[PDB]
Subunit: 494 residues, 4 copies
């Protein structure tokens, strides 16, 4: 059951979070964050820049000093603290879900039942990892005792996007804190509010000052300051490919900090002719339109086998037409607005391109309301591989349907991409399922499902969709620095 | 025993190795490689460049295609092929040890008993890993079966330095081939010969064409072409910090290939007053002077507790004065020449630097012979933390001895460095050992020993000494791309 | 701080727990449980036998059926329930600590600060494992996909002793429940009360009926019924070597159920001449006297190097004399009574044997009070390896101090035992600690400490002290049945 | 190709193997081993008894002493020695195959291409494990460093059966030796010869004296001596359920040695109506008839969906009717004789019972030759779950075919067995494959294949088919004893 939202939740936190305290920017500058449903300013937010990052990194560095409360704390107690954070987030769930919706635009029902659930499950999962990521004892040649310590990497810069503000925060904080790192987080200018409120809960949970610092602000300013910082040990970036490149170059040009990236995709969703029709149609709809189409791994190339194409297309158009666009706080609403005017206008431009390049417009194609950034659920049929809308990440409610004949054809066409974040296969055949799931060059392959995230199972890109993995045990790798200790012993025995 | 060397081994391979075949550069250009003991040209070698790299990468890509012999091959069979390569290397051990000495300058006894031994152990270790690096089955929420595939990362560019030509080749090839990758290797222009001979053995072992491709040539040409290549999935680099940066920048500016790095160090070797004096002196000598000082993890800061400083220095100077410099094919020789003229001059520069900034010249400090690139074993005493010779990698037979009072003091001074590749502690005390091994910010901490490498134990840098780890199970992480497969099932049960 | 105890806590649960309900024994029989401080009956408890075990196993089996709530439950939710259970135990901590003291005899301060803390930590540790114990994907030869499912073993019979009633229940429930198993637990007749109260909390926590079943009763009846049962898949037993044998025999004679055992010990505690004297003496006191001497891994052979023997003994005797025996509810009490009259009499008999065989009685030797099962802290000096008190587990406040000369000697003497549960080494020397910890034939070796249990570190016997390990990741092995699934695929690729 | 066999290979080894030397039985008694194809004696073999076992155990215990060659040997070198043993077995492959066939009865082509191949692959697989089975470093609470040593279990008794003499030896020796254990092996009285020759190869490979000891002889004599021995640390037994009980009982009644068992099966092979008919018929035939039906995990309940029952049965009969029985040395022979007269008679007895209990005899059912233990490939139709031949392991060329309607029905019928060694599923449907592999209570589930063994994938029984797993990483668990070392440190940091 979903509790009634406060459709205008109060903002308590809108500043820079350093040493468990709230600070204005050194410059005293602020920036507006907008409600995408109305285009109205919610409030002002402190505009962190390089000087503010510097304060945060110093705070983080001090928290990480040998002998500090956070360094000496039992690993099991890091788990306790993550679990306490989860509880606090659960206590403030109704509030946080409404705040998420206000700033981001996604339906409140979804914020509550999906985002907040996943946030809670991610943190509780990683709480369990805190005291279980063992190093090794190693049967080295000669008279030595050799072992590894799994130590934290240190000061971790974490730059996150706007599409799942709370969940992305949890994805980054969970594994970092489980392994005893400290954090300087740069949240998206489009959606700083919920992450800032969680910083209040981080302090309430009992985390030592400087363990988590949050600098709201812009990319080329606050973001780049972190990526280029001489005392940040590790950077994790989620967002556009373009800025992914900027991050890796910044790391190379500065102190050679360790780097992981989660970037976009143009993920293919493959519907074989022996698929369950109703299930396939609904899941393809979900795969594309989920979160206003603002999902890294959106199924934005829907490949359909020729024998079922006409039927699949018909049922897909009908479903897009029935999809309820409106006020995210209304319980009927399935699709809220796009995050901002920039994305709003980029999506419309993609639709213009789709039309002019000869794809068949089957429904939508225009603005869904005269207020806020609402776009009609749009479906293009007879899409070809060379078309812009088949190549570029649109990040909106714009569906691409492409026809194919053979299993070998679809494999090569799905893989003919410099992206490789995810892929999906809809089929009842065992061999086809296994053939495709092996042959597909993607970080995740869903079979008869889509967008199934589990804190237990890793996620990340092939090719230019990123590097490294998040979630599961693998999510701990990039947050661990490995030390070998090799000790001379009187006489080594098995 | 050691078999008598051929002091003038014949060169059989001096071209570019692609698809198991020997090729001239497209340009037909060649470059001389020099014997550092005599300063004379050994032979000419094909000068690979961008167009040659492109050929090598295309061949590697072809060998990596789905359904190729190398992709279809049983994992256990990759292990078989690695064990065979090792057998052939051992067959040619005496020849290869001489050729290594000729091209590189290190003592033949060392080439034979150390380098070649470690090459064999590395390959045989990784052979064993071929069919054991499991993925996971994962108890994900909901009605799903979730698992991961550990796939190869793909086309792997490997750019290696000159200080351990054969050993670096093996450190790179072992884990890459064990996990089913394909390789484009750029060997050092100073030392191309031994690795080109190994390529012949790679063909003899039965490796499919395109699996290993070797392009000798220079850095800004051949190496930069690998680093910037749009179809190289992963690059591994070992060398200078300067070029490390370039590599990471080129990776970021191109296709976001995955990057691991092994760079310099200024590793602290800490001698507590309770250490075994005779042992610590001899091991501190080895820690610095091993391989003409040309070791990434050389113990180039010798911190000695004040109570034993005077005696420690006296004994170190006598040991350095006794160290035999000469023809590396002569069995009495402890120390051969530096690798080339560039390094020779660089080291002479650092020696003069040390004298100018007021470090106490205790022995050596000059050119050791007329022909070749021989330098006297040199010891500086009363070295201070702020001195350039205390901060910068010298990569020559130049020893720094520093004085400290307390264990807390020495931790801070050892850690005060942008480098963090290795460290060592000499002590009889349980608590001192554990306190320091924990506190030292280094990839490897040796206790009462130095330069102890096991194929089983990982090695790599903290901070600007690099990122990632080689050797052990950890050496397989960077050579693996992870894929999650999540499958809808009728009813998930435990 | 420690909350004031209720010295007469009320009993709410004293029946058989099956399907989340309380039941009398089918025979309607009850047995008294006694307060060992007074010798007086606390209450009657339902006396379970074969008929009751049969009901419990059937409930367990039904709860374990494919498609049941417990089988379908997300592994992450099993973790939620374990965490909920821990929260509930924490809510009732002061009550549970007082009931533990009432029934067992251990000091309330210790029940509260140690046992209850460890219980909480054990369950919260295993909660985190629930969704993390991955199976494998395996690169088998040929055109196959091969993986392992880690399934629960099934119906687990758990027979637990009286010395740490709540803690042993947690050691058993944590791993078994985290892995999705179902339990029939036979608690000790001396200490059934606290475990029965926890069953109320298991129900309250929301564990499906039949998942945990608890049958109080005697050993030859209820316990043997579990061991011999044709539908119990796995038995874990903790107690005497003698009953350990009965268990393994019963399992081989019935259905070949899987068996793990934790049995007695005669663990050596080795004090080298370079040990810290004050610390060594205090820790050797703790090592022996902890929990009224009633600890499986009690340090019951104190080997002291001859040069420090005289002083060590003198201080140990002083410490044993100052040790406060009395009412376990009084804050000053260090030592409570022994658990029952049988143990009481057995210990006094072992004291007699010590006097008879010519060990030097240095303090204690008799009863400490005229009411309750209290025994004086007793120290024997000059113990010899052949004496009964040096060979057999006494399980009481009786300390054996033995003299040795060399490290080689003490290794042989320490390992000359059919037991091998634990051992310790007290020394400042790095090499001695490494030499000894390698050489000692024991499941746990402590260095400069004793009785350091962590939920993270495994615990278990060598030789006749048992088999298999509890705690840590290893504690899940016995609760897992492994299934290989091997699937034909069109064409296997790496 | 397959090299021509020597049809009367010479026996070089027929004694007891202790300390790398050949010994007569203390009693000087011998027993004959018979060629099952002719019924004639091959040679006499030393008849080992209790006293011979005592000698062997003492040799093994001496080899296992701390500081011995076997104990001090580098883990990597144990690997080298396993690899050398494999090389020697391959050298002698053609002879061993012929000798295997002479003593066992299986076709020479199978001996050469299957058994010998698998032996080589198993030994080489485990050679790679030797230096890779790491212990753990553990982030325990408090100021402690805690780690685990993976030490060998010790003296391992290994009692093996007669169906895969050479393969079972490798399955036991591979993991035991990889982890540094020592072995007392008791080979089957029916097939002692090939194992004794391998012992000669174990000496040639360089294994220290006492590391592997082999005692030929009878079960209630030599086998029981091993199971009851006070100085054997671990027993592994493969054979009947009946003796499996005896082994577990003896372990319990003696020194509480660790026990793993691999016992019988009545494995279900389930053919869904959507299976590939031609493939399933052939694989069902293989599943049952392989190795003269003498396979632990034989597909001895063939469940066939009603819609395809008639055709499947017809095709099965045609294949059984044309299966070539004859001289195992003839290239065309698919099926040799049963191993001995006792087996011969028991199988014919089961054929009688099958007829008597109302199963439809469709082909075969009698003796195939007038000398040797040759039985006609026999197929029973319309088998019911209640029939003896549906319940008991026949271990011969006797196929049972049962009819089913629904997937839910077949699950209950398959699992209604005290056995659970293996199962198979033949279907083209994704969901049915996943539904069944999860639901079936068996240690291995094959999908669209059968008898797919890989050194990489674990094998072992559920229920009364045994406990523990052989092969893969899992096969090392039983050969490892875990030691925790927990060290007090001045100040624990992450
Ligand atoms: N699953 C298998 O791998 C397997 C193997 C062989 C036999 N079997 C089953 O057992 C039946 C009879 O065969 P079997 O009698 O040759 O097998 P078995 O179980 O009696 O003997 C197997 C091994 O154990 C030894 N052994 C026999 N009695 C022993 C005892 N009392 N104590 C210790 N060791 C003892 C034997 O010498 C042999 O080495 C067959 O029909 C078959 O069903 C199963
Ligand atoms: Mg941008
Ligand atoms: Mg350079
Ligand atoms: Mg008893
Ligand atoms: Mg028998
Ligand atoms: Na906003
Ligand atoms: Na050279
Ligand atoms: Na009691
Ligand atoms: Na025989």
């Amino acid at each position: 059951a979903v509790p009634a939202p406060n459709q205008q939740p109060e903002v308590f936190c809108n500043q820079i979070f350093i040493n468990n305290e709230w600070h204005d920017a050194v410059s005293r500058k602020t920036f507006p964050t907008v409600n995408p449903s109305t285009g109205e300013v919610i409030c002002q937010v402190a505009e962190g820049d390089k000087e503010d990052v510097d304060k945060a990194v110093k705070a983080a560095r001090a928290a990480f000093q040998l002998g500090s409360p956070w360094r000496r704390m039992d690993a099991s107690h890091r788990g306790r603290l993550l679990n306490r954070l989860a509880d606090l987030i659960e206590r403030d769930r109704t509030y946080l879900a409404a705040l998420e919706t206000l700033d981001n635009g996604k339906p409140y029902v979804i914020s509550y039942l999906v985002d907040l659930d996943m946030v809670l499950k991610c943190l509780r999962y990683y709480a369990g990892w805190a005291d279980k990521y063992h190093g090794k004892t190693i049967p080295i040649d000669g008279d030595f005792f050799s072992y590894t310590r799994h130590e934290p990497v240190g000061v971790c810069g974490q730059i996150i996007p706007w599409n799942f503000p709370l969940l992305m925060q949890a994805w980054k904080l969970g594994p970092a804190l489980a392994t005893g790192n400290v954090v300087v987080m740069k949240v998206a200018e489009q959606t700083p509010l919920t992450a800032l409120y969680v910083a209040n809960l981080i302090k309430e949970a009992g985390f030592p000052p400087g363990v988590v610092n949050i600098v709201p602000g812009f990319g080329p300013t606050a973001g780049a300051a972190i990526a280029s910082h001489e005392d940040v040990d590790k950077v994790a970036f989620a967002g556009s490919t373009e800025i992914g490149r900027v991050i890796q170059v910044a790391a190379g040009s500065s102190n050679l900090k360790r780097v992981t990236l989660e970037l976009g995709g143009k993920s293919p969703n493959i519907i074989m002719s022996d698929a369950d029709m109703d299930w396939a149609v609904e899941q393809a709809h979900f795969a594309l339109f989920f979160n206003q189409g603002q999902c890294c791994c959106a199924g934005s190339r829907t490949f359909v086998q020729e024998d079922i194409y006409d039927e699949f297309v018909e049922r897909s158009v009908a479903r897009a037409k029935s999809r309820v666009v409106g006020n995210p706080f209304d319980s009927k609403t399935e699709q809220g607005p796009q995050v901002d005017e920039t994305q709003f206008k980029k999506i419309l431009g993609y639709i213009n391109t789709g039309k002019q390049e000869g794809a068949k417009l089957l429904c939508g194609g225009g603005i869904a309301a005269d207020r806020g950034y609402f776009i009609q659920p749009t479906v293009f049929g007879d899409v070809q591989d060379g078309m812009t809308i088949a190549k570029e990440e649109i990040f909106g409610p714009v569906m691409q349907i492409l026809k194919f004949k053979t299993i070998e054809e679809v494999v090569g066409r799905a893989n003919n991409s410099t992206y490789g974040l995810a892929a999906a296969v809809f089929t009842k055949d065992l061999d086809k399922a296994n053939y495709l799931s092996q042959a597909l060059q993607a970080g995740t392959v869903w079979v008869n499902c889509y967008d199934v995230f589990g804190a237990q199972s890793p996620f990340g890109g092939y090719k230019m969709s990123g590097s490294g993995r998040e979630l599961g045990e693998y999510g701990l790798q990039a947050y661990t620095e490995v030390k070998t200790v090799t000790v001379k012993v009187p006489q080594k025995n098995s």
